Write a protein that binds this ligand. Sequence first.
Ligand code: CLA
Ligand code: CLA
Ligand code: CLA
Ligand code: CLA
Ligand SMILES: CCCCCCCCCCCCCCCCCC(=O)OC[C@H](CO)OC(=O)CCCCCCCCCCCCCCCCC
Ligand SMILES: CC1=C(/C=C/C(C)=C/C=C/C(C)=C/C=C/C=C(C)/C=C/C=C(C)/C=C/C2=C(C)CCCC2(C)C)C(C)(C)CCC1
Ligand SMILES: CC1=C(/C=C/C(C)=C/C=CC(/C)=C/C=C/C=C(C)/C=C/C=C(C)/C=C/C2=C(C)CCCC2(C)C)C(C)(C)CCC1
Ligand SMILES: [Cl-]
Ligand SMILES: [Cl-]
Lengths: 238, 449, 61, 242, 44, 336, 35
Amino acid sequence: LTYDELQGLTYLQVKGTGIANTCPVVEQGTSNVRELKPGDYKLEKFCMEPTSFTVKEEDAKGREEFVKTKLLTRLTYGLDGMNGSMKINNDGSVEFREDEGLDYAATTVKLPGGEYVPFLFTIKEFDGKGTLDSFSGDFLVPSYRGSTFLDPKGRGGATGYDNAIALPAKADADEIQRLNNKSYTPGKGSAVFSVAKVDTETGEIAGVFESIQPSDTEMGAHPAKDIKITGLWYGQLT
Amino acid sequence: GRDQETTGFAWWAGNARLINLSGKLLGAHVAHAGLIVFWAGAMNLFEVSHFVPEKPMYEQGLILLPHIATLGYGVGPGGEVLDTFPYFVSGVLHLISSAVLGFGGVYHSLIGPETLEESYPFFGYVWKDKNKMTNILGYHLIILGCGAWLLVLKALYFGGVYDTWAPGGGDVRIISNPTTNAAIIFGYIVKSPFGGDGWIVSVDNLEDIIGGHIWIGTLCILGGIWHIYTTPWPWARRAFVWSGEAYLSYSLAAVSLMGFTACCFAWFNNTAYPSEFYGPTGPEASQAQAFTFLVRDQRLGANVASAQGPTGLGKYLMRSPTGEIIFGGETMRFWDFRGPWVEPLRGPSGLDLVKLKNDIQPWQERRAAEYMTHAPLGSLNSVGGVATEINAVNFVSPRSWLATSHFCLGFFFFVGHLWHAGRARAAAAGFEKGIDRVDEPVLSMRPLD
Amino acid sequence: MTSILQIALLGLVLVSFALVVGVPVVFASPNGWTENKGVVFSGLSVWFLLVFAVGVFNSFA
Amino acid sequence: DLEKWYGPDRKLFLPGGLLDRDDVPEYLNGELAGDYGYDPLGLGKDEEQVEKYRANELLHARWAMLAAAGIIIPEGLQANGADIKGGTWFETGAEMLNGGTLNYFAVPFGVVQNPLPLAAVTLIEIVLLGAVEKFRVDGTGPAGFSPGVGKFDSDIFDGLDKLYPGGPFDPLNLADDPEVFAELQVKEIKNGRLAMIAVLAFAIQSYVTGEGPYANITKHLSDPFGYNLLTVLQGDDRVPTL
Amino acid sequence: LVDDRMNGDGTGLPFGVNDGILGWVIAGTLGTIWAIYFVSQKDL
Amino acid sequence: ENTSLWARFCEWITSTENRLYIGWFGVIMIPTLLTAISVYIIAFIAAPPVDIDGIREPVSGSLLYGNNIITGAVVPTSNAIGLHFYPIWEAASLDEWLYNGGPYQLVVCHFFLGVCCYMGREWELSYRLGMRPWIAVAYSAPVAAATAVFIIYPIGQGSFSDGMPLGISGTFNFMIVFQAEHNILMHPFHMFGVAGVFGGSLFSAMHGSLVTSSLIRETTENESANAGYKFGQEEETYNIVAAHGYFGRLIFQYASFNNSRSLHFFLAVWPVVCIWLTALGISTMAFNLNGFNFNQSVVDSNGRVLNTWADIINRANLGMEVMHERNAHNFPLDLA
Amino acid sequence: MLTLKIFVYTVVTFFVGLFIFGFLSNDPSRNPGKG
Ligand code: CLA
Ligand code: CLA
Ligand code: CLA
Ligand code: CLA
Ligand SMILES: CCCCCCCCCCCCCCCCCC(=O)OC[C@H](CO)OC(=O)CCCCCCCCCCCCCCCCC
Ligand SMILES: CC1=C(/C=C/C(C)=C/C=C/C(C)=C/C=C/C=C(C)/C=C/C=C(C)/C=C/C2=C(C)CCCC2(C)C)C(C)(C)CCC1
Ligand SMILES: CC1=C(/C=C/C(C)=C/C=CC(/C)=C/C=C/C=C(C)/C=C/C=C(C)/C=C/C2=C(C)CCCC2(C)C)C(C)(C)CCC1
Ligand SMILES: [Cl-]
Ligand SMILES: [Cl-]
């Protein structure tokens, strides 16, 4: 469904059907992609949806690979209702920038073998430089949980116990990593975009994207994995 | 009345002594209907006398004045009462009808005919006469069909019924072109009773309400004619037990199902039970709490789209299991709630972030806060909200009152249906008094091991 | 005009109280209903007349 | 059939448990049509006075049926769209006072302008009604040619029964069988009592509301709470009780 | 979309069916049991 | 003459010669309860962690994921789902279904149908054996209690995550949260239920004491005193009178329970009606009818708040309130 | 997951039909006593 036919459906017609998670596509557009003349152009209604969630799996024998995984959370991942500014030139240089909107989604995915991998699928504070065929950059990645989040045994970051209370002989080595640290330091992720199927008379772009971002460290207990996110992205362009 | 020596029933089963006495049984019903309409009139007059106009109707412990107010008898374009004379007229008419019905019931209980067949064959009946019982059932079905068509006539021609879904915050709306689509009505009756569908509570507009009422009235009238002009089929005779106790048990099961269903209407429905008269439902005042804090924290300057609460899901906006954008708090259970102050704010993809940023009406702003304060919490001795509060405000929701009471009555009537169905089966089989002691069924069976 | 309405309503209340007290008494008495028919009919007629009078006087008061 | 309306075990004006069977007056023993035993005042006296007042009751009943039809039907036609010019019953005489004349609407080929003035109408009405009321008491009629019997002579009303003369007044027969004749007599007297009550209602409603009974019923069906005896007795409205 | 679902929950589907095959197997099973009961009623 | 398939099927289902009576209520009792038993056992043994609070926070619950019998439980459905009817086919995969708490919905729905058909089967066997049928009426009280705690309380609160967890520590967690949010100990229906179980224990002890006390020598210090006569005689000689005599002489001799039928009817009705009352109390608190709120209800002549045992209960209740689902709440006061 | 739904729907419809038609099949007549 395109954006014109998405607005033509009521809320009750699309409720419980999964259409609200889909991003609208471009049907009458062209693949020339070089139809954008001006710059400083302020795109809006930027929206992204993934098509695959692959987790980097470093073994202990020395080679690099990604594995297909199964999603645990329902259609609650996905990026919608966010805007920004794009500075596209005549030669083709594209300056992407996203400022505000629903620019994150908490997602839990299951590795083969039954290991839960939570991560925050974010695109917040993303600046993209490059041509129409491919422009990439970096985006800020929050940890996962806030500083007021409390684990099973209090502890927590800003609030909590900062120790496992129901063990009176504690606060020693091999527990500082779990009790005392409780780090919430933000990470950074790199994504690469591509523009295809552009609509000229109304300003619509809908390409594909590939994103690499670190996984969740809970509160710094275990090192982060790397999640590869591929999918489609759409944004109104006015 | 008789004693236990002649009837075999003790005083705590005295109404069983009049099972076979049609005249006294009729007197018991007429006096009882007088009692019901007496409660209607007396409680209506009590709620009128204890009425403060400037306060909203749900903050006063009123259960049936909202029932008249839903019909639109003396309410304004915002739920404002304006006048209470229709309420007074309803109470007085119910009280006078109670006097008439009580006189009739007392007359037939005391000096009425003992049994009706020897003098009035039209009203005389035996429990085994399936044709006569279906005749009485058809008479009552025609009466119920006329009762439903009375509400249909009021909604269509007498300029009544209050639409809470009307723009601006509801208004008394005369209904034109009700949806009488058979697929639509049967779709409401066969859909799932769970959260996504809601079975029959999820009717959300007066057009569908009056279409279903047209259907139920026409069906009741046609079925009344059918039972008057027919006799039960042999398969029905083989399946059912034909006695006065079995008929009571069937009625008990049906009315217990009705009581459970009405409890569910009270707790969840906001169309046939408008919030301006009944108070907020369960889902709202929690959705309202999630909305007021969003519009407060975006007035203070914080970005509600960034959100990211303590668990990284969203303090104000999040995503439901389906891709619709919903309120980010713990009230993601009530994400399927629909309200008059929500739908103009809501779109296809979700809650319409642009509308949440720009288009919020002051009437919605006032309504959501006043719904948040008057939640369907409350404690049984009045007092305020959650069980840990203090003696500050005197408010318990009428939705809570007539949901709890109706669930209790529905469960008791299911228990009574079990009791009467079992006793009717045992009485038809002949062993409702005990085991015969000289030929018991167990000694005629082989041992299990 | 409301004073006449209040007197009629008070009379209706007293007549209804007398009826509630006496109709079971008349009915359940040994052969008392067959001789109290006149007084019971007069009481019921007065009660209905008072109800109709209060209803009519509501419009003027 | 006939036992329900005649004999000791008949429908009375009060039920058995509210009225004993020996409380009926002795001059009402279920021998006349419509005998419900309703005579609380000492007006019937004896059986011959009851029979004498039965003639007044039957004449008033038939005149009231003709009345009730003549009030309801033309006013309904006028309100629904027919060119009646005076369909309301308490003002139909004022349309002929000076020079006006009532248009007759003989359905379906109605709307005809009658040219007879009020004086001629009154003269012919008094003449014809005096003639028929004198023929009723005397029981003599000169000419014939009724569908009941072809060209009956003058010597046929003599020997008949007064207050129920069969023959020339019975074109459709269906009354020679005595049992259905008695049942239809009960039907006639009950319809006549209903018509009397209805025409008294028409007069009282006209005096109270100022409009016709058809206007009354149409406005009541349009809004029963907004238009009834309570509303028309009140006046315009009342201040809302807030 | 990373996974496939029927997405039939909600929307007021009659008897919860989202495909015609479900209504057909329901009707066929009821018809089979009714046919067995009818041809085998009254203890034959 | 039972030569047709449905005739022999009806005669086998209805038959009382089976070791366990099936009946027309059993044809639904058996498959639903077997499904619930299988799914409950498999989930209790090896279910993956279930995110109950809908905040991407899974509770383990199953033994293979590191807990014992006392703390192991089948975890209620996810909070984000609500009471939204989540079966296996509505999930994208079994892993997602297990993450979102679908086993709880499956087991609870099948258990509700099974206990309803268990009441029906009790009636059916009472009918086929020529008995009186109100044993099912007596059994309607635990069915009401289990039904109210498993489906009606989730219906009132808006989510199956409010259901009682299928376990022991989960039951205690549900009970404590219920105290915090409804003040159940301050509810007269719960008081009636507590009085009912205490009185049921009292009356069971009294009935056992009065029947086992009122004996005659038929079983000596050995296994049996059959020296008068062996097995195979109808001579009933237990006692009829001295039990009622002792119970009368115990307090005031006018608490007449000489009628054994009246005594047993009282034994049946008292705990049953009290469990009915406490089940309906739970059902009423499901719609937030809550308990008695006498907090800050006693004030002195200057209006200063005087503390109370009810105030101490309030302090404990709000201490429980601030500790329940510490990461689930965003907005200040908690509304179902 | 569609064929799982088909199988479960068939099973539930089967058992419900057994319930309904078994209670239709002369159920009050299965008593040890008269009538
Ligand atoms: C909804 C409540 C209700 C109603 C309508 C009835 C009705 C009836 N019961 Mg019953 N009963 C009830 C509750 C009720 N009962 C309860 C709770 C119990 C358990 C304690 C009993 C136990 C019981 C027994 C043991 C018997 C009855 C019997 C009867 C019947 C006749 C009574 C009689 O013959 O003696 C006459 C009774 C009186 C004269 C006293 C009543 C006084 C009057 C009628 C009522 C009050 C006056 C009233 C306000 C007047 C209204 C005024 C009016 C003008 C507006 C009658 C139809 C009898 C029966 O079964 O018939 C064979 C019988 O023996 N009942
Ligand atoms: C469930 C309602 C009901 C039923 C089935 C009966 C049935 C019976 N009544 Mg009875 N009655 C009733 C209510 C009822 N009554 C009430 C409420 C009163 C108080 C006014 C009376 C007062 C009464 C008396 C005084 C007597 C009877 C008598 C009788 C018996 C003779 C037939 C008859 O109809 O008499 C006639 C009853 C009437 C004419 C009452 C008027 C009914 C009108 C036509 C209203 C029509 C109903 C209409 C649909 C509106 C319904 C109400 C609406 C607001 C919902 C008969 C078996 C007689 C008897 O017992 O024989 C010994 C008798 O003496 N009844
Ligand atoms: C202590 C006893 C008691 C009391 C005080 C109440 C009180 C109440 N019940 Mg209730 N009930 C009870 C016992 C009780 N119930 C029991 C034991 C059961 C079985 C479990 C039920 C089952 C039940 C159900 C299913 C429902 C109620 C409902 C109600 C509420 C409205 C009553 C109503 O209007 O119904 C209906 C009245 C009638 C059917 C009489 C027919 C007359 C109709 C209404 C006339 C038509 C009006 C017309 C349109 C007016 C226009 C005028 C015209 C000229 C234009 C009310 C506060 C309703 C509710 O609010 O839901 C919670 C409802 O749906 N009850
Ligand atoms: C409209 C429904 C209805 C009707 C018409 C009947 C009719 C009848 N029932 Mg029955 N019953 C019903 C519902 C109904 N029942 C329900 C819902 C239950 C479950 C609670 C029962 C349980 C029941 C039992 C156990 C028995 C009967 C019996 C009887 C017969 C004699 C009644 C009598 O005189 O006892 C006299 C009436 C009283 C003594 C008053 C009862 C007082 C109750 C128990 C206290 C509660 C009332 C209180 C004010 C409400 C508190 C609030 C509430 C929510 C708890 C009679 C034909 C008897 C029977 O089987 O005869 C064949 C009998 O043994 N019923
Ligand atoms: C998605 C749509 C949702 C809405 C649709 C819902 C439809 C529900 C219709 C059920 C109403 C039937 C009432 C019969 C009840 C038992 C009567 C009986 O005791 O019956 C017994 C009685 C004994 O005398 O017999 C008889 O009177 C015979 C009367 C019974 C009528 C038989 C039904 C028609 C049979 C059709 C067979 C289906 C065949 C298989 C189709 C296969 C397709 C692939
Ligand atoms: C009004 C209205 C409406 C409508 C509704 C409807 C339409 C309903 C219905 C319904 C229906 C349409 C129903 C039906 C039914 C039936 C039933 C419910 C039944 C039953 C029974 C049973 C349970 C059975 C049993 C048995 C068996 C099982 C077999 C054998 C025999 C016996 C009997 C045993 C609507 C909502 C739209 C809107 C609003 C209002
Ligand atoms: C038989 C019997 C019984 C039952 C009884 C009953 C149920 C009765 C009743 C009855 C009734 C059901 C009644 C009712 C009534 C009513 C009345 C009597 C009324 C009235 C009126 C008036 C007078 C009013 C006035 C007023 C007004 C107008 C308004 C304002 C206010 C006032 C109040 C002023 C018993 C149980 C005992 C026992 C058994 C036997
Ligand atoms: Cl929250
Ligand atoms: Cl907790």
